[PDB]
Design a protein around this ligand. Sequence first.
Ligand SMILES: OC[C@H]1O[C@@H](N2CNc3c(O)ncnc32)[C@H](O)[C@@H]1O
Ligand SMILES: [Zn+2]
Length: 349
Amino acid sequence: TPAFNKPKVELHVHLDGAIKPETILYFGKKRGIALPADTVEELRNIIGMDKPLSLPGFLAKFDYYMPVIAGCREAIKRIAYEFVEMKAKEGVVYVEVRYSPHLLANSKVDPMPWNQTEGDVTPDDVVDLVNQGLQEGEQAFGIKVRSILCCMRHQPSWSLEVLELCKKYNQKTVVAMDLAGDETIEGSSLFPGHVEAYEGAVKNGIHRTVHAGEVGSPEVVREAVDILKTERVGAGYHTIEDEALYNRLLKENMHFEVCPWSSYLTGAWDPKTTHAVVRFKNDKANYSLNTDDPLIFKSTLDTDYQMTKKDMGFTEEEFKRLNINAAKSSFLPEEEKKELLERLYREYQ
Ligand SMILES: OC[C@H]1O[C@@H](N2CNc3c(O)ncnc32)[C@H](O)[C@@H]1O
Ligand SMILES: [Zn+2]
């Protein structure tokens, strides 16, 4: 019994965070790379989390499985393909999947991710592979899907190349650039590589999103918006701690990519306080409801919908509104953007 059984738009989900345990298991065995378990069930208890941790503590779960996926072309394309399929089943009509192309390469990257052995899967090759998987999926489960390439807070030396990958693959699935990773890393928002990568996104008209205010302070959000020029804030819950900042983002109609379940499990949100999306709903803010890393959170898009419904008083009207705003806030070009809005209004009749 779904909380909102109608078309949805998802703007914040990590491809490397939305993989099938069965596919992880499949590639570990197939490539002979070890996993912390040999059963999807136990594999799910290891990778998965059911209790709040920290952002740094949540980010480590990727260590368990990324090594069986990274560097494998067959695996990179497959997870992309299975991703559309999963979203299609969730009643998502449009989705932007994000991921770091560097963390899945085994060539032309430095530091080599996961102590991998050099190979031929270059970062560009990864983008190409995901596009192919994503394309085959759209054209098979019939949902529209775009991708977003992530700069990693810890590795700014990779940022300018991410930008280049966005330029080269512009709308050839890639619609934007993100800044993901450990938001606790003091000053990561200000590292030259990142800063310079965004400055170029602005001059070359490459869309921009940035995780900020998930666990960091208002100043992290302020810098994402003012220095990095984000068009959207991933999470952004901590903005409400700076009344002035919030009101001004509210005025600019800043879009907040909200992930309810994820915020509890990463400690982004203290469960003894009211969720910031409650205030967002009440101030009629521009915001989407997203899944983030469903593999690790052992969830689905309905988990976040059921949570807001059951615990935060969300009605179908708010569900409709947030998704129309998500559509408007997407990085789809005008024509397609309108086509999306048209479908929502049609189906929302
Ligand atoms: O998907 C690209 C990377 O972004 C990082 N992620 C995933 N989830 C996530 C969270 O919302 N907050 C910050 N960074 C995150 C992970 O390290 C993942 O490998
Ligand atoms: Zn995220």
